[PDB]
Amino acid sequence: DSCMSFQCKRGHICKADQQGKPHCVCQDPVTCPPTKPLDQVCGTDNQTYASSCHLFATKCRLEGTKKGHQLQLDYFGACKSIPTCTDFEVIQFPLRMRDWLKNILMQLYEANSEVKKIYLDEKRLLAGDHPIDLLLRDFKKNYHMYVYPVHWQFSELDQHPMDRVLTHSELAPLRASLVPMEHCITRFFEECDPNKDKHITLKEWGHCFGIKEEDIDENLL
Amino acid sequence: CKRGHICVCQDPVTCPPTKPLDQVCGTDNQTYASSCHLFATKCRLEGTKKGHQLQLDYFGACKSIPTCTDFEVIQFPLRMRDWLKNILMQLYEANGDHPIDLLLRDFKKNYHMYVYPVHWQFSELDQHPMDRVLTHSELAPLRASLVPMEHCITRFFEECDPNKDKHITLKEWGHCFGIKEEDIDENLLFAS
Ligand SMILES: *[C@@H]1O[C@H](CO)[C@@H](O[C@@H]2O[C@H](CO)[C@@H](O)[C@H](O)[C@H]2NC(C)=O)[C@H](O)[C@H]1NC(C)=O
Ligand SMILES: *[C@@H]1O[C@H](CO)[C@@H](O[C@@H]2O[C@H](CO)[C@@H](O)[C@H](O)[C@H]2NC(C)=O)[C@H](O)[C@H]1NC(C)=O
Ligand SMILES: [Ca+2]
Ligand SMILES: [Ca+2]
Ligand SMILES: [Ca+2]
Ligand SMILES: [Ca+2]
Ligand SMILES: [Ca+2]
Ligand SMILES: [Ca+2]
Ligand SMILES: [Cl-]
Ligand SMILES: [Cl-]
Ligand SMILES: [Cl-]
Ligand SMILES: [Cl-]
Ligand code: NA
């Protein structure tokens, strides 16, 4: 068997020729391992695939075409309609701060349901478009607790290739992982690429996490 | 007199003046000018279905948001959520036999990372009164805090109260967070 150790790209498998010569052919989706519900994945076509094996077998069958070239794994789970991740869903605050925020919101609710002056201005941020960002603005100025984590996330992603900008393919693992963790879809190129050139610089990334320009420093990468 | 009462109904006119940012969302998915106006409205409607149901839901105007998931409600420490994120990103970059199924099944069986926090959250909420069950008034502040913090709406009494008695026991709570019965333990709750 010449197919032993003959490597093939994902969605392809090695099959011997009528002459015994090994060839990479598309994988038949029927041969994909049986699937459990949580194996499901959502493709960039907003189609749900039973598993990653099924998606790449489909992509292979579609090699050479627009839909084939476009199809990628988008995130884990079935395709869903979900809101855009916020910055703090991407890069979280310490648990102590999340308990504090939860407690003032709960306390603010109990005072208003079936104190009010204390947290009045706080109440009116929630009717705003970015309540948590504004309430946590002072925290975001701390280097060890916020600024450095924001830089470290950029440099962790800027690897394919490392060039001080992030592209779609570099952000795709982060997008895929936040759906199960946070039930939100990142939209970095709708929100953090204001010149629409499809490359996110450190300045664009920092601004999108609300870090002042004076605190953005390429030496931390 | 109760909120919205002053016992006659409160005149909406005497409600403090309202700014746009005073708006609130009622459980009817209606936007009210402020919390005062919502309960004044509730009073004018006392005695009816629409009247009895109406409660404060969350601050701000009503919006479209999905139902909260288990991992949105349970707040993890940074170190553990960072570990979980890096594992998931590694599973993506690669693309067990069913990695995501196995990862989440094992995670939800882990006591220090998940089972105990699910029990702690029940017990933090079970205070009015402390009686080993959760009612609407105990879960309503958690719901309102999760809208701004997680952009999701909890639906505890539609999904975690299968006998429809308006009380959520520890057993119902655990099952609704995907905890096996063998791992539900009243000894993990704050002492009596
Ligand atoms: C991608 O697919 C998901 C799943 O079918 C869509 O979410 C559905 O959207 C419809 C509205 O057209 C709603 O009635 C359903 O409740 C949604 N289902 C879920 C599970 O969220 C989503 O809208 C699709 N997005 C696009 C752009 O096609
Ligand atoms: C609760 O009310 C809000 C506000 O009217 C609804 O949100 C809107 O939904 C419509 C159509 O579904 C959209 O055109 C609007 O853009 C939405 N507004 C916002 C602010 O998101 C929401 O759908 C209602 N909730 C339910 C469950 O019906
Ligand atoms: Ca790069
Ligand atoms: Ca750009
Ligand atoms: Ca109780
Ligand atoms: Ca969320
Ligand atoms: Ca019950
Ligand atoms: Ca649940
Ligand atoms: Cl190949
Ligand atoms: Cl984080
Ligand atoms: Cl923490
Ligand atoms: Cl916010
Ligand atoms: Na969480």
Distance to chain B for A215, nearest Cα, Å: 23
- The residues with which B59 forms a beta bridge, in sequence order, are B24
Q: How far apart are CA B57 and CA B144, in angstroms?
A: 6
| Both tokens assigned to B152 | 């999701």
Pocket test for ligand 2, best of B24, B63, B68 (most atoms within 8 A of CB): B63
B164: left (phi over 0), alpha (psi -120 to 50) or beta: left
Q: How far apart are CA A102 and CA A98, in angstroms?
A: 6
- CATH code, B182: 1.10.238.10
Question: How much distance in Å is there from the Cα of A187 to the middle of ligand 1?
Answer: 17
Q: Torsion over CA of B58, B59, B60 and B62, rounded to 10 degrees?
A: 10
Amino acid type, A146: Y
Local structure of residue B96 (DSSP, 8 states): -
Amino acid type, B115: V
C-beta separation of A146 from B78 below 8 A: no
- CATH code, A31: 3.30.60.30
Question: How much distance in Å is there from the Cα of A83 to the middle of ligand 3?
Answer: 26
Residue reference for tokens 């959502």: A42
Q: Name residues whose C-beta falls within 8 Å of residue A81's C-beta, 6 or more positions apart in sequence.
A: B66
| Both tokens assigned to B70 | 């288990």
CA angle B5, B11, B17 (to 5 degrees): 110
Element (H, E) at A26: strand A22-26
Question: How much distance in Å is there from the Cα of B65 to the middle of ligand 6?
Answer: 9
C-beta separation of A130 from A191 below 8 A: no
Element (H, E) at A153: helix A148-157
Q: How far apart are CA A158 and CA A150, in angstroms?
A: 13
Q: Name residues whose C-beta falls within 8 Å of residue A140's C-beta, 6 or more positions apart in sequence.
A: A133, A146, A147, A209, A210, A211
CA angle A33, A38, A43 (to 5 degrees): 80
Amino acid type, B183: D
Amino acid type, B10: Q
CA-based nearest residue in chain B for residue A156: B86
Q: Pick from B179, B139, B166, B151: which is nearest to B56 by CA?
A: B139
Q: Which domain holds residue B130?
A: 70-188
Q: How far apart are the first and last CA of chain A?
A: 48
- Regarding the beta carbon of A80 and ligand 1, being less than 6 Å apart is answered yes
Q: Torsion over CA of B93, B94, B97 and B99, rounded to 10 degrees?
A: -20
- Regarding the beta carbon of A130 and ligand 1, being less than 6 Å apart is answered no
Q: Pick from A42, A80, A83, A37: which is nearest to A190 by CA?
A: A83
Residues in B touching A101 (Cβ below 8 Å): 145, 149
For this entry, resolution in Å reads 2.3
Residue reference for tokens 């999108």: A208
Q: Name residues whose C-beta falls within 8 Å of residue B181's C-beta, 6 or more positions apart in sequence.
A: B171, B174, B175
Element (H, E) at B169: strand B168-169
| Both tokens assigned to B40 | 């004044």
Looking at all shown ligands, the one closest to residue B169's CA atom is 7
Alpha-carbon B119 to chain mean position: 15
C-beta separation of B53 from B88 below 8 A: no
Q: How far apart are CA B35 and CA A111, in angstroms?
A: 10
| Both tokens assigned to B169 | 């026991």
Experimental method: X-ray
Q: Name residues whose C-beta falls within 8 Å of residue B42's C-beta, 6 or more positions apart in sequence.
A: B4, B51, B54
Question: What DSSP string describes A25-91?
Answer: EEPPGGGSPP--GGG-EEETTS-EESSHHHHHHHHHHTTTSHHHHH--EEEESS----PBPPHHHHS
Q: How far apart are CA B129 and CA B133, in angstroms?
A: 9
Burial class of residue B135 in the structure, from the number of CB atoms within 10 Å of its CB (0-12 exposed, 13-18 middle, 19+ buried): middle
Contact A38 B95 (CB under 8 A): no
Q: Pick from B68, B8, B71, B72: which is nearest to B40 by CA?
A: B8
Q: Name residues whose C-beta falls within 8 Å of residue B112's C-beta, 6 or more positions apart in sequence.
A: none
Interface test with B, best of A90, A103, A126 (most B CBs within 10 A): A126
Q: Name residues whose C-beta falls within 8 Å of residue A190's C-beta, 6 or more positions apart in sequence.
A: A84
As for chain A, the residues directly before each break of C–N over 2.5 Å are 114
Q: How far apart are CA A55 and CA A52, in angstroms?
A: 5
- Regarding the beta carbon of B187 and ligand 2, being less than 6 Å apart is answered no
C-beta separation of B142 from B154 below 8 A: yes
Q: How far apart are CA A66 and CA A24, in angstroms?
A: 21
3-state class (DSSP) for residue B43: helix
Pocket test for ligand 2, best of B23, B28, B58, B62 (most atoms within 8 A of CB): B62
Amino acid type, A127: A
| Both tokens assigned to A50 | 């039973």
Distance to chain B for A88, nearest Cα, Å: 9
